[model samples]
Target chain A: QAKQQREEAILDAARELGTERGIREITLTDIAATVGMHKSALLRYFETREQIFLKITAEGWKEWSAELCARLRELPGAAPDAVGQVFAATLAARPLFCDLLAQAPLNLERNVSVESVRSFKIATLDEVGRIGAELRRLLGVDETQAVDVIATATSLAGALWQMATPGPHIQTLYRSDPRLAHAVVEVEPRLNRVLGALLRGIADG
Target chain B: QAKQQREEAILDAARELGTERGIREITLTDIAATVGMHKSALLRYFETREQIFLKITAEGWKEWSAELCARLRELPGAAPDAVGQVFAATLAARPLFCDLLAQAPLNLERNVSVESVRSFKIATLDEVGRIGAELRRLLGVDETQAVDVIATATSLAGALWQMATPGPHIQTLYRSDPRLAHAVVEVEPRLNRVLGALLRGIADG
Candidate 1:
């Protein structure tokens, strides 16, 4: 219980600091100071800054994945529109999940440890396999097609996240490109369109 | 001619110094030393350190835009497949532009000048507007649609650059994922897919 409490406290502080400032700003001392413990006491829980930062980052992903899995499990039977519906609902329910997925492999790396980062990737692949299995049970996709679906889904996630950022380009699109602007606002519709197309391609195969 | 030569010399020296030792490592004195001038003389030519940085950045963009325009002009008339094709080609030709696009925006508020950055944004809108007009001529879109086309194109460019970095998540993507492996190699095709969908959405409007 003490270990759990300490870990949770550290993660909570890290997440709060991350949200308020950024991962770059939040030092080990910040976490230790928040927990009212010496840095060495905090190090007892997480030996290195990398380990603690990785744990926090992993917790972010782990929690999101858990929420997503529960939501997917609750969806009704293998309708033709199941995958698209599952995707759209999941995205709409958790923009932060989308944000994490978008940012991993892009925006947030220096804060992640190589070893922990490797484990997280393996964990994501496992999650993808689980989602693929659910899709197969519901929508009846073959193994190869399931992998393809997962791969394309990853690409789409990366694309959509980059698309959502309000850069000079997004500003231009938001003002002038109505269809793109609409698709961006409703991530599900965009995901659905692409997922539907991929499913159609599979069915044809 | 005197101003043009002096400015060109300063930019050239700055670029050279930056490439040699990195942008942060190179100072005003270093740039001046490279140009065989005193620091005060260099300051006279370019005001503060931030002004010099912004001027170099602007000069880089101007040069990039001209090359991108020339490249667009070089492509066949049929290649303008909405806004995406042009984006893919331009990004394909110059990966550095994309890197700068991704890093510069986040750094805008931090490095350089607040005033320069504000002016930069105004200048950006002007440049994008000009590019949007040229893009409209190339792609046959309305005024607003043209703006989104360029904006979305630039976003895709930024995303591609972000993906290329060996940062945390991207490193995982590179190491573990085969599709992303394909993207790492055939960046052109990936950029095309990412941009094509947005352009298609714009056209569908």
Candidate 2:
């Protein structure tokens, strides 16, 4: 119980710090201080900073997956636009989830142990499986096709988030040069459009 | 002339190290050792490690853009699948380009100066514009639609490359669990399917 409590405290600190200060700005020291524990003490509960973030992100993925499944079921129609609308909105609502995901393969997953990485990938595989199964049911597509679409959608969300969430200088650069306006990544609209097209293509195919 | 030769030598070393080892394993020390230059002397040519990689990636984008345009023009037909096939094959042929791009936003672009970033972005914009125009002509699409499709294609390439390039543990996990086979990122096939769908959808819409 104490171990579980410490894990939650670490996670809570991560979420708070990530949301307020940005995930990139966070460090093990910062998370440790926020939770009123020494860095070494925190290390006992988590192997590395990346492991804590990975665990937190895993929970976020599961939560988001559940909400997305619920929302897909609740949708009034199965049209591509409707499906895309729901999926895009579901993703957009969870900025933390998207942020963690964007950084996962590149940063978070890099520093963890093989076992930790394995568990995380397994959790991800299961989540994608659940989501893909529902999408297949709703869209009446073959299993392979729905799985492909789900993979593409999540990849798009992660990429789009990075592109859209520019640093201050990039924002200024985009604003200044008319030619560079295309550099501005507006997440939801692009997600909706691309996801809608992908779904519609599968439906027609 | 000597300065230009030195710059090319540095880029060649970067490509060799990144391709033979891994992009992440590369460091100034590694590249300097490969090129027989001290770290500080290497800095005289490139401002930072990220800048070196960015310049390498920029050259790659320009080179790929040239080859793609040549291939597109040499093609006998302009069918959407044919175009996508060529595009996908073109991207698949350039793994280093995709690998560098996969790391660009999260890793390379982070530490560079604004001027460096701006120049790279400008080079990218030019490359994309040339490709988008050719695609528009080949696919008989409007300017807006063609540009949008091109943007999405490159983004997908970068994003999908990261998703599919699993490390050793991920590879083992995928091999162990039948359910995790989808996690095994077969780069070209996945890229082909997603890009083909997007292109076909744009053509139809």
Candidate 3:
């Protein structure tokens, strides 16, 4: 668990820094200072600043994904009605993850350390592919369909976030009018619905 | 058109500066110089640096939506395949725009001024609604559904950009797989078909 602890320390510091300053502003030296380690010492563990950043981000994503999967699994019988609860919970639990989720592709991909970006990509490819595999296994999508659905579904996390902090008036509209959800849903349904639908579609197809 | 020309120059500067220095490092003076104006005079046009950057971005999005609408309209009974074509065209026409599109919600929302963002939101709402209305007219979708479909379709632009920039191994994989195009074709499969199915489902309910 030393690795986990160290990584968690790094993540905690990075998240705090990222929240306070932009992630792009935080360097390895900044992270090192936050973690009470020498820059060189931290590099020994992460090999590069991006590595630290990516690992922290990947861990954040994995943590959120696991929590959501468990929450979904806990819903009784996987009935159609259960989707509402799954969706609301997923949306609320997801903001922290999504704030970063929307950012990582744009920021972490380029701004963080290159080595970190490299490792992050491998992790992302594996993580996203695993998500595809799981959805396929659980919902019975063919391989090609799963890959396609996952690619589109996974991509919407950013747009949804853009949508999250809506104008007060628009917020009221989305909450009050079923139709306005399309303001967002029309284009990309919520990740919960999008991903869940893909699973269901794959199963039904 | 003095105002328009100056603003465009500022945006061009910001974007060019963004490419080299990243979005975070871009400043008001930097953009001013790009337009060959005084920063104070530029500030007359934009209250803050963020405002200037976002205003330019707003124009870009408007142009983008218009261009895409034109492209889709010209697609001789081929609207179903509009997704890939629109996405590719958007990227091909403006790579930085794609990058901005990816990072804007997260990046622009934060560092930039609020009035600028408000102006952006208003302009975007107008443009998105205009184009969404056009899409509805073209596709026979309701305003609500048109908004949803258009937003989602546009959201996929970022994901496509991410894929186009293949990672180290992904680059190799993409290069090696002659059938990769087949794989991509199987993934989202004609935006219109997907949108049509969604419309039917919503309509039925």
Candidate maximizing lDDT: 2
TM-score of each: 0.63, 0.93, 0.71
In candidate 2, which residue pairs clash?
A: none
- The interface RMSD values of the models, given in order, are 7.6, 2.3, 5.8
Instruction: Choose 1 or 2, whichever is better by lDDT.
Output: 2
Second chain of candidate 2: TM-score? 0.92
Docking class of 2: medium
Q: How far off is residue A82 in model 3, in Å?
A: 7.5
Which residue pairs in model 1 clash with each other? A105-B169, A105-B170, A109-B168, A169-B151
Native-referenced DockQ of model 1:
0.12
Error of 2 at A138 (Å): 2.0
Candidate 3 TM-score, C-alpha based: 0.71
B126-151, model 2: which lDDT tens digit per residue? 98889887887888887666666676
Error of 3 at B174 (Å): 7.9
The digit string of per-residue lDDT tens for model 2 on A148-193 reads: 7877777677767766666767768778988777777777888888
lDDT of 3 by residue, B1-205 (tens): 9787876677777877876655545778777887788878887877777565566567778888888777766654324334444545554556456555565555444565544555566677777787776666555656655555555655665545544553344445444555344222221343333344333333333
